């Protein structure tokens, strides 16, 4: 009965990790047994910054080896760094790593990906290939800024083409200088047909936790 | 002109240097004595020096004012935000039918090439129920895709190409706009896009002018 969510962004640097920490915080506060994986990571803090962020959200209940399989140091590709260092980001190895968690006593398993939907894992594979092999739903994090509507709709359409369920989308309103935030969110909802699951801003709010909790119910 | 070739120019994101590429395409035509026109039917972002939008001014300057602002643009907004949002706030309807008529009305002119510069990405909205793609579909013309090479460009370029392919829209070519010389692994990213998409890059444009630039850009038109 374990719920599973593969977390992707609409672009690189949409605050996806920040959202993962908020989802972890909701589970922890509700005494829900959860785990958040970061199977592929880049950019060192010994451990990568996103790996450290997730371990810190769980108050070190888990280890880096329990959540991460492969790490890169340059903030470009995991995939271009993988080719430069002569290592592979293998779909089968990542699939086995994630599916191995399915018999743990968890209510929810989150899997934070390595950027966008078609972020490559090689010059012949993308993150979609892994998500499609897993046959699990996606949680899409959209950073609200000029151009986000095009990126959010493109990502939702690609998911639809490959019959990957969209469990929900989250508006990361990480920049209060962006004008017409509410209008951009309403447009994405209208054009996509998906109501926004949660509107998260820098200003901490309990509605964030109420809305985030509903994704998990 | 019955022989007129048409190209709808779109970007992988809102600020990818689309207009700079359009000015280079105009320059190749002007130099080869090819009769061309470049439209910017929907524009946003006021010029630094006039009441007109910056992209409208760039196109007019590229043609040395052989055309008027009314010939190249139908709808303009001062704010550099999603055009449909300003349109809704200012009681302006961005209509697919009106844009289609504005563009198709140029087809009886003595032009060898018609460029139409779009207003952001493929799915940038024109309203709460339409996007740029609806106009492109209605026009039945090929697209030129401008991709700014930067981290995240692979995902955006592949998503845009796949959306074109789903709606049976011809991709005339994609251009790598290497507008930021500080970006790491530029050739590796272009190579990844070519291998995953199946489309060889039509032209690699950098901050420094090159012979390859004009040869490659000319080949898109021939
Ligand atoms: Na296991
Ligand atoms: Na493949
Ligand atoms: Na589907
Ligand atoms: Na006419
Ligand atoms: Na529609």
């Amino acid at each position: 009965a374990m719920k599973k969510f593969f977390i992707i962004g609409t672009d690189t640097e949409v605050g996806k990790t920040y959202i993962s920490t908020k989802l972890i915080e909701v589970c922890e506060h509700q005494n829900i047994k959860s785990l958040c994986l970061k199977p592929v990571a880049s950019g060192q803090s010994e451990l990568c910054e996103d790996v450290e962020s997730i371990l810190n959200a769980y108050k070190h209940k888990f280890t880096a080896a329990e959540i991460n399989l492969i790490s890169f140091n340059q903030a470009v590709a995991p995939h271009i760094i993988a080719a430069k260092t002569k290592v592979d980001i293998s779909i089968e190895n990542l699939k086995q790593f994630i599916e191995d968690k399915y018999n743990q006593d968890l209510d929810i398993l989150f899997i934070e990906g390595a950027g966008g939907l078609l972020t490559p894992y090689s010059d012949h594979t993308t993150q979609l290939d892994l998500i499609k092999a897993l046959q699990i739903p996606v949680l899409l994090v959209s950073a609200i800024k000029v151009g986000c509507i095009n990126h959010t709709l493109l990502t939702i359409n690609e998911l639809n083409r490959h019959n990957i369920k969209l469990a929900g989308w989250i508006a990361n309103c990480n920049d209060s200088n962006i004008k017409y935030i509410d209008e951009q969110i309403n447009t994405i909802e209208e054009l996509s047909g998906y109501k926004c699951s949660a509107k998260i801003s820098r200003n901490a709010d309990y509605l964030d936790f109420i809305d985030l909790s509903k994704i998990l119910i």
Side-chain angles (χ1 to χ4, degrees), chain A residues 159-161 163:
Chain A
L159 291 174
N160 186 8
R161 175 62 186 148
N163 296 323

Side-chain angles (χ1 to χ4, degrees), chain A residues 96-104:
Chain A
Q96 286 184 20
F97 179 76
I98 294 161
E99 293 188 332
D100 174 49
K101 313 298 189 184
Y102 297 178
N103 70 325
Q104 203 163 317

